[PDB]
């Protein structure tokens, strides 16, 4: 029950899009996709479309497993933001680029009391338009639950490597 | 609703429990925030800045802590055997809020249970996302964790980065990092920046990935054995001494080349496991240093000791104690943020009190003692 | 041929004026390697691979140079006076290379030329863009400015990068360096490399450019009077009051947010220039940390004493002495290699000689005395 796309596929969607907001997580360390991440970033800037960085708290296995590797691939400060000062900005974005993230983004933190992710804070990026969820599998996060977001028509599955498949939509656009 | 924050009395602890920020937030809920005149000298808070933020400056550490409801310290509070009475000075029937190390040292607890104290021992938070703002545990080890490589840095003679100048090539320096916790990563991080070839290494089959997601390459021992390796909350295990043996075997061609090699290898309860024997010292090269976190633990390598930097066989063996409070600033914030967000969901809205709910997973876990009795199962 | 190098002698100088690779080659010049005992010892450099490449071991410094036709040293021989005579332990009418400080050090000169000594000062030499491998000055200079950044890390409180973190975002340091030189601009990678924020100044306008390539932010002053302020060689010149105040002002703004304060600022023949005056750190934030590599010049702050970390209105002063000796292991070859491409040029094809070029500019702008005649015009 799940809205699977290509490479091809997301390349239209953050071309054909005013706003975008990259969510990295543990995935994109993982695939070390973060000079290609990047890339993708400052090709929608060029053509001249918003983009911004969301960095959860607990993004990755480590505090500050993002901003070291986006500080590795040369992406700017100001570009990237804390969770409480960007949630609100999913509202008036189109695309939320979730590369390698997952239970940073899951809503059951919020709609299951039962649930182990219940309390933490998340990013709402079910509040843009639509959502692309790059991840090799249909596998859970870190804490082993399934994603709400995973199946409903505002999202997409990319299934595969983070690095292949952001070089990929690097390649789609130009 | 009276809320204290001392000066850390304990020698080689520049740290405090309180940031303005976190005086702002706490004032805002219902309380009077007291703190200790150059509480947070060693961390860059003035006395200035607190009540700036809305706090009452008290002169001694007698008269904050007398008529306060809670009271936030870093380290456990000190008792008569050791001196000086800071368990005495608090308040009876108050809530206490701090890292405890309640597991090791039981007299602390009865000394809080006999003043009819609710001591928060904030190490035994549990390991969950719902919890990770309110653990001390990982803001202070992540912290120690880039320390280490610049200590590393610091009593190493060569540069970090490789280097391509006009007088010649000078190589990058090998970093070998033992145990890939919170601290370790941060460690593989820092050193990994600065431009040095990363190894590292551990027991449970998870970090092999971790290791490599930093842009370090992973030694393996016994990717059969390493799949039992973790525990409730992530934690390792004891692996016996015929794992001891198998580790140090396949390392050995890795440390030989090693110029500073990061030992954070702890478990917990227990002491630190030998990661680095005097042994395997001697055929590491002159000029080399080992940088032990687990030092005030057993150490990782029997060599070095607390608060010393020990010289043996060409290697600068270093083990410093307390390596967060050589962070104070920016751990200390972090530290007042931890205690701030355990506190908040329990401050009654409509009245200006506090409860702490018994069924709250956070709260019945942290609890060592009270109302005057050890609650804690494991005590 | 013999060429002979020593332990250094002088207070906490760790380096050696040799390696492993630089013997091989020497060897393959015609040179009979001796080196003292435990001479490397400081920069991991020990006796058994020198002696692997080819070379043999003396157990004293006399015994090293006794019959030595040629010697090489990091810095300058010990007089009489000073503790012990080094300048007697080398034989009569051999050549000495080192970093002599010639300019400053007359007695030592006088020495030399007294046992018709041939000494060349290797920090003399000419800023040509063919006499950089061979230059001791620049890659000193390269590790003093990474040193630089380890010890303000050091001795800061703070962590250099940005950290987003469940108990809250760490703000990364604010590094600002002033002399963007080959220190300068080492500084500016390394503490780029550790995730901070750097903001840079100098005189020169060519170094607007170097600064924003490795990812810092330039600090623009008098953009007219900068261009009126490079030298032949490359090097600063005097600026005056005028500019001193114009720069004190433009760089206030920054130095409030500043953590970390680099100065590597210096003017050859003249002190160096002050860049921070002691009303400059009453404005800067407790908890701050300033590293000043030209100490040792007087200091581009009044405030800093060589050897010495001061702490003063809530700032640490850090100046440390001899600052590429805290980096021993890496100085070293590098030294070593800058003496052999310094020699090299003037050793026969195939006669076991050592023919100074006396019309090369290397060997002119350098040579202090010869044989007992002090021919620099000084
Ligand atoms: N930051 C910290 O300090 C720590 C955080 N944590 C926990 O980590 C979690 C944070 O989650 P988050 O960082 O969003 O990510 P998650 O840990 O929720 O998972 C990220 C997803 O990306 C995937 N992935 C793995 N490898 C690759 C690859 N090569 N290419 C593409 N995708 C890949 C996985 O899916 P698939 O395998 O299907 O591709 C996985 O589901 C929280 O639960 C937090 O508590 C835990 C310990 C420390
Ligand atoms: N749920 C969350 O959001 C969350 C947040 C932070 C940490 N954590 C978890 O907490 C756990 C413990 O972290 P920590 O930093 O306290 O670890 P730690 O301080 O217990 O020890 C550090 C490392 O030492 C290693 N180690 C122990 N004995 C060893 C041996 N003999 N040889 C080699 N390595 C050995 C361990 O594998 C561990 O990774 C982690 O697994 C982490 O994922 C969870
Ligand atoms: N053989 C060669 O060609 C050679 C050797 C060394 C340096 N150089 C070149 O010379 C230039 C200077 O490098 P250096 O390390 O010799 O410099 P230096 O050590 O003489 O001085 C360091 C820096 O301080 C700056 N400075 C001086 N007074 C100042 C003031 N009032 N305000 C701000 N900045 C001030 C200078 O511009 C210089 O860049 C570089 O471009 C370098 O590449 C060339």
Same mark, same amino acid.
């Given at each position: 029950?799940?809205?699977? *796309? ?13 706003? @975008?907001?990259?969510? +990295? ?8 996709? /973060? ?5 993708? #970033? ?17 993004? *990755? ?18 570009? %990237? ?9 999913? /509202?008036?974005?189109?695309?939320? &680029? ?5 239970? @940073?983004?899951?809503? #059951? ?11 933490? +804070? ?22 082993? %639950?399934?994603?709400?977001?995973? &199946? ?7 299934? *595969? ?14 | ?140 080890? $992540? ?156 150490? $990782? ?18 083990? =410093?104690? $307390? ?14 943020? $931890? ?6 969901? =329990? ?28 609650? =804690?199962?494991?005590?």
């Amino acid at each position: 029950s799940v809205k699977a *796309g290509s490479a091809e596929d997301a390349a239209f969607i953050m071309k054909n899009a005013s706003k @975008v907001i990259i969510v +990295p997580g543990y995935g994109m360390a993982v695939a070390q996709a /973060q000079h290609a991440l990047r890339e993708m #970033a400052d090709v929608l800037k060029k053509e001249g479309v918003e983009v911004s960085y969301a960095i959860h708290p607990v993004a *990755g296995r480590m505090p500050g497993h993002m901003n070291v590797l986006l500080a590795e691939a040369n992406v700017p400060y100001d570009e %990237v933001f804390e969770l409480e000062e960007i949630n609100s900005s999913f /509202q008036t974005a189109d695309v939320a &680029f979730v590369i390698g993230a997952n239970d @940073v983004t899951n809503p #059951a933190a919020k709609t299951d009391p039962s649930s182990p992710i219940y309390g933490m +804070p998340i990013l709402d990026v079910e509040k843009a338009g639509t959502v692309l969820f790059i991840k090799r599998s249909m596998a859970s996060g870190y804490a082993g %639950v399934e994603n709400e977001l995973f &199946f409903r028509n505002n999202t997409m599955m990319l299934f *595969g490597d983070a690095k292949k498949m952001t070089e990929q939509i690097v390649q789609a656009m130009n | 609703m009276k809320i204290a924050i001392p000066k850390e009395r304990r020698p080689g602890e520049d740290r405090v429990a309180i940031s303005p920020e976190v005086v702002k937030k706490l004032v805002g809920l219902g309380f009077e925030v007291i703190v200790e005149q150059g509480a947070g000298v060693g961390a860059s808070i003035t006395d200035d800045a607190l009540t700036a933020a809305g706090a009452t400056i008290a002169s001694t550490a007698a008269q904050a802590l007398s008529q306060a409801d809670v009271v936030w310290k870093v380290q456990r509070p000190m008792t008569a055997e050791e001196g000086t009475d800071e368990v005495a000075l608090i308040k009876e029937g108050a809530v206490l809020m701090c890292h405890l190390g309640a597991l090791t040292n039981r007299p602390v607890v009865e000394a809080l249970t006999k003043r009819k104290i609710t001591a928060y021992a904030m190490e035994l938070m549990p390991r969950i996302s719902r919890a990770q703002s309110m653990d001390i545990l990982s803001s202070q080890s $992540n912290l120690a964790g880039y320390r280490a490589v610049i200590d590393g840095a610091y009593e190493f003679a060569r540069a970090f980065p490789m280097m391509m100048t006009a007088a010649g090539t000078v190589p990058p320096a090998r970093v070998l990092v033992f145990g890939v916790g919170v601290a370790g990563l941060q460690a593989i991080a820092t050193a990994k920046r600065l431009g040095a070839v990363v190894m590292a290494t551990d027991v449970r089959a998870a970090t092999k990935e971790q290791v490599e997601s930093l842009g370090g390459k992973f030694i393996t021992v016994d990717d059969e054995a390493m799949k039992t390796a973790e525990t409730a909350g992530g934690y390792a295990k004891e692996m016996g001494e015929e794992f001891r043996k198998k580790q140090a075997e396949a390392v050995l061609k890795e440390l030989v080349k090693t110029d500073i090699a990061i030992t954070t290898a702890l478990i917990p309860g227990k002491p630190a496991p030998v990661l680095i024997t005097e042994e395997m010292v001697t055929k590491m090269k002159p000029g080399s240093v080992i940088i032990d976190l687990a030092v005030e633990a057993g150490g $990782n390598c029997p060599l070095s000791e607390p608060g010393k930097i020990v010289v043996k066989h060409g290697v600068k063996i270093v083990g =410093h104690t $307390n390596v967060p409070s050589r962070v104070a600033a920016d751990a200390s914030p972090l530290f007042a943020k $931890n205690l701030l967000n355990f506190l908040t969901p =329990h401050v009654d809205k409509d009245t200006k009190t506090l409860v702490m709910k018994l069924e709250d997973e956070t709260v019945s876990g942290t609890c060592v003692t009270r109302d005057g009795a050890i609650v =804690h199962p494991a005590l």
